[PDB]
Design a protein around this ligand. Structure first.
Ligand code: AAA
Lengths: 427, 558
């Protein structure tokens, strides 16, 4: 009730005004979950219905934090954050610990509830505007303003830092070798203990928070057929880009070698220093595609050369803190996914391949959206900031089914490609 | 009178101020006309005279309009509209009848002195000033100010809507289940109560609104059953459009057709058949509207065809949240698609047509899928769920396309429905090189400056071919090449191009296109049993191709 504290004055980065992101039509099912959620949030005083005097909007969505669980609200504070958080990231910007990626295991604790306490500048409430839509435009929507720190605004966790840096003080003291990174209401705790011990020092910390700040972290475990690692574990150490493999059949049929010159060709921009001339000679004459033509001395020398030169990268590890890392995905096979996070063209900081056997989660959109989540979570761990995604998906189609398989609390910036990717190769 | 509703605080864009636009005095005639008016307007309390302490003001105008016997008042506050803040757009959407349930009875309550009763913010009242002059440069200055939502002021439309919903909340509380929809100056009360019983509630409402100051001039729930709303002809059981009259004559301009095209579009909502393909295409070449646009036999035929369909006044039904929604699709014409979503096994709910234009050289299977989504989107908005699709396309065919497409897609539950045309990937290229089959090394260039091109090929047997080409750009001839390759190959063939473009198209599995050339590449492909398209970096030294490009450029270079 009357248990608030002083607030931190927030102000839009000079230049821009309040955001006004048009709200996407939501299905009836989800609207129900939203209206409900919202009502309790009004019954709890977290948010207060607002009038027309506010022409602001931030899209809302409904998602189930866990399989077969209840609904969870999700505001798209991407825009507001950009103006508001891009100013505040240089003032309260929470530094990123590189020790997180070096360690073995990492658990991601949802600490969103906390923010639900600290009241926001009675003046900034205006921007947090979020409109719940109604079918057929019958109603212009139950507009809503936020009171406490919404679980989406990148400026919130910044404020709540005060308390968080304290709550953790004790724990950290007794557990010195555990790094605790905090990104957007996500507690990224890392360590090197044996997983057996890890599962302990995590519940330990989970039991700690719950003791001092009444920070309640949604417990999570799946003893079912779809058994996911305990505590939703990650393993930064187990991460590296080596899947690029040239066929062992490069000197068989002309067609083959032809393809070989295909891969090596484009690789010219990714790995400056590769040659192909010698190998091209072999396939220089008008011939059939199935005619077998073995390797030759000079062709062989340059194949072996490039064959390995592909394993060990060159320069490119130029992480420009200014240039935003761009993430680009490429649908490959049946259950096989591949992505590349670069800053400049062909100068990637990391590449990977998402694997989710097609069948159960057969949904292309499910696997893509799944990959979209996985590709970022790590991105957070390694660069500590969300990459801009290029998804090989139909604009309209993506926006329609992305909230359905989404189990994240943040929303990566994305744009849609509409052109056949030449990157669609064996890798 | 005036509503005792909770006002709404408005302000001007930070950095702006009350409009300082003095009014240019019209003839003393209307000057009086303004007097007689504002007077009573002030007597009602809607206004209060204040001349000095409010420097701001706007131009005040008065003239007659639209077959009426009493004077009018035109005070459009646009300058003020420029300095005033932005509001939550009253209605950011368009309500679609199809998403409405049938009511046993409905009426319309004209709430025309709507805004004039809602009081404006105690502060902003100032920024709504207007100057009343006199005759022969003699005039002390009758400056006025509104106490309610100005006739034009930007906030009016908004504030009012936000104030009405409040006005009505308590009512629908003590007496619920009576669909109330409010468009600007129109109130539509609807329910499933007998003509009388229903009108029994209407009064309860009216007097309720009489309590809140909104005096419904309509002595009763009197209104024309055939409600004309947004082109929609509405009834307690059906909906449609009607004013879709299409005139014809010689020498129609680009403007004329565009309008006619626009008309044909709207009707499609309910009338399943409207085809705007040829007419819409004729509008191509946007520039001069008054320029008479010529229609060719085809375009003319179109008009004819649609014209009769329009002759048929097809009725439209409403929705029911107990029967599962269905969506049937039919592949029509070449690049035009039509669909009908229905509840009852025979009663059209809503009808639409997907106009393929997104891109040229599109696979039909892709088109369908697109239309699918287009439908899902439009459905979601209107009703609240996704409908089950009746789709004209073999299920097993779909499984092939999705698995092999760079893009990801999703199609809810959808069953097979055999209609006239079947969605089926016509041809399809192989995966690996055919053992034995003759390999053709195609190639084509063209001196861009002279538009002179050259195509040809070279098989794995010294079979060479070349044919001169005119008015052709590099890419076009590249296709012509692959064409020649197809023309003199076998049921099983292997082709090697240097063109990124040639592969971009063919491998796209295209079927239709306004490109005879491309079409015949499809023709030849549709006939052969096995074809293997392969690409190699041009000008990098590739088997044959290296040399090919040589015999192709057997003359002028580019
Ligand atoms: C969204 C809505 O219910 C509605 C929208 C626009 C118009 C013009 C009328 C609307 N409803 C009415 C009503 N009085 O309830 C209605 C008519 Br008119 C016809 C059939 C059903 C309904 Br609910």
């Amino acid at each position: 009730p009357i248990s608030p504290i002083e607030t931190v004055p927030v102000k839009l980065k000079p230049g821009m005004d309040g955001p006004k992101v048009k709200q996407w039509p939501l299905t009836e099912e989800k609207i129900k979950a939203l209206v409900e959620i919202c009502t309790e949030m009004e019954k709890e005083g977290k948010i207060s219905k607002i009038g027309p005097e506010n022409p602001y909007n931030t899209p809302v969505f409904a998602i189930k934090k866990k399989d077969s669980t209840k609904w969870r609200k999700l505001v798209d504070f991407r825009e507001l954050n950009k103006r508001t958080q891009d100013f505040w990231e240089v003032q309260l910007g929470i530094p990123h610990p590189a020790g997180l990626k070096k360690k073995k295991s990492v658990t991601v604790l949802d600490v969103g509830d906390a923010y639900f306490s600290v009241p926001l500048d009675e003046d900034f409430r205006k921007y947090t505007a979020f409109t719940i839509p109604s079918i057929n435009n019958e109603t212009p929507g139950i507009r809503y303003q936020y009171n406490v720190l919404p679980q989406g605004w990148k400026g919130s966790p910044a404020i709540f830092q005060s308390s968080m840096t304290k709550i953790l003080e004790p724990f950290r003291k007794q557990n010195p070798d555990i790094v605790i990174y905090q990104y957007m209401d996500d507690l990224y705790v890392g360590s090197d203990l044996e997983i057996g011990q890890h599962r302990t020092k995590i519940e330990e910390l989970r039991q700690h928070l719950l003791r001092w700040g009444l920070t309640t972290p949604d417990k999570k475990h799946q003893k079912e057929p779809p058994f996911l690692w305990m505590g939703y574990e990650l393993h930064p150490d187990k991460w590296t880009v080596q899947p690029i493999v040239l066929p062992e059949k490069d000197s068989w049929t002309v067609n083959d070698i032809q393809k070989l010159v295909g891969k090596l060709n484009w690789a010219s921009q990714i790995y400056p220093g590769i040659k192909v001339r010698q190998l091209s000679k072999l396939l220089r004459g008008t011939k059939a595609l199935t005619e077998v033509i073995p390797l030759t001395e000079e062709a062989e020398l340059e194949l072996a050369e490039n064959r390995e030169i592909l394993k060990e990268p060159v320069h490119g590890v130029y992480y420009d803190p200014s240039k935003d890392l761009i993430a680009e995905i490429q649908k490959q096979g049946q259950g096989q996914w591949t992505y590349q996070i670069y800053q400049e063209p062909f100068k990637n900081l990391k590449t990977g391949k998402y694997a989710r056997t097609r069948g159960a989660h057969t949904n292309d959109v499910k696997q893509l959206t799944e990959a979209v989540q996985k590709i970022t979570t790590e991105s957070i761990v390694i660069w500590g900031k969300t990459p801009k995604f290029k998804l090989p998906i139909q604009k309209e189609t993506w926006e329609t089914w992305w909230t359905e398989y989404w189990q994240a609390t943040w929303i990566p910036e994305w744009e849609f490609v509409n052109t056949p990717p030449l990157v669609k190769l064996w890798y | 009178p005036i509503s005792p509703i909770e006002t709404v605080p408005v302000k001007l864009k930070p950095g702006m101020d009350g409009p300082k636009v003095k009014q240019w005095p019209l003839t003393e005639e209307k000057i009086k006309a303004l007097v007689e008016i504002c007077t009573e307007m002030e007597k009602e309390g809607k206004i209060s005279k204040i001349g000095p302490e409010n420097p701001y003001n706007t131009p005040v105008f008065a003239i007659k309009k639209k077959d009426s016997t009493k004077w009018r008042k035109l005070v459009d506050f646009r300058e003020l509209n420029k300095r005033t803040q932005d509001f939550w757009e009253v209605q950011l959407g368009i309500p679609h009848p199809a998403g409405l349930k049938k009511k046993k009875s409905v009426t319309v309550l004209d709430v025309g002195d709507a805004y004039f009763s809602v009081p404006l913010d105690e502060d902003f009242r100032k920024y709504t000033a207007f100057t009343i002059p006199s005759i022969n440069n003699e005039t002390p200055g009758i400056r006025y100010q509104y106490n309610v939502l100005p006739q034009g002021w930007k906030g009016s439309p908004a504030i009012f809507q936000s104030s009405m919903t409040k006005i009505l909340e308590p009512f629908k509380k003590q007496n619920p289940d009576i669909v109330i929809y409010q468009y600007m100056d129109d109130l539509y009360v609807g329910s499933d109560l007998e003509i009388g019983q229903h009108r029994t509630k209407i009064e309860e409402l009216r007097q309720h609104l009489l309590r809140w100051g909104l005096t419904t001039p309509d002595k009763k729930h009197q209104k024309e059953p055939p409600f004309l709303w947004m082109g929609y002809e509405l009834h307690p059981d059906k909906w449609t459009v009607q004013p879709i009259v299409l005139p014809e004559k010689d020498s129609w301009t680009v403007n004329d057709i565009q309008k006619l095209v626009g008309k044909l579009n709207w009707a499609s909502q309910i009338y399943p058949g409207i085809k705007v393909r040829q007419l819409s295409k004729l509008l191509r070449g946007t520039k001069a509207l008054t320029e008479v646009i010529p229609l060719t036999e085809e375009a003319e035929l179109e008009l004819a065809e649609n014209r009769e369909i329009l002759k048929e006044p097809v009725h439209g039904v409403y929705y029911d949240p107990s029967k599962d929604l269905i969506a049937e699709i039919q592949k029509q014409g070449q690049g035009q698609w039509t669909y009908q979503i229905y509840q009852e096994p025979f009663k059209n709910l809503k009808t639409g047509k997907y106009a393929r234009m997104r891109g040229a050289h599109t696979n039909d299977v892709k088109q369908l899928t697109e239309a699918v989504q287009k439908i899902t989107t439009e459905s979601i908005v209107i009703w609240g769920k996704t409908p089950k699709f009746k789709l004209p396309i073999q299920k097993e065919t779909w499984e092939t396309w999705w698995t092999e497409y760079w893009q990801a897609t999703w199609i809810p539950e959808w069953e097979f429905v055999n209609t006239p045309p079947l969605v089926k990937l016509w041809y399809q290229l192989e995966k690996e090189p055919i053992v034995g089959a003759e390999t053709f090394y195609v190639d084509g260039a063209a001196n861009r400056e002279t538009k002179l091109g050259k195509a040809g090929y070279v098989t794995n047997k010294g079979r060479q071919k070349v044919v001169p080409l005119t008015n052709t750009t590099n890419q076009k001839t590249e296709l012509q090449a692959i064409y020649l390759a197809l023309q003199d190959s076998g049921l099983e063939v292997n082709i090697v191009t240097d063109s990124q473009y040639a592969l971009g198209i063919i491998q796209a599995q295209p079927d239709k296109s306004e490109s005879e050339l491309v079409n015949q590449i499809i023709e030849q492909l549709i006939k052969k049993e096995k074809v293997y398209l392969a690409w190699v970096p041009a000008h990098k030294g590739i088997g044959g191709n290296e040399q090919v490009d040589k015999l192709v450029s057997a003359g002028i270079r580019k």
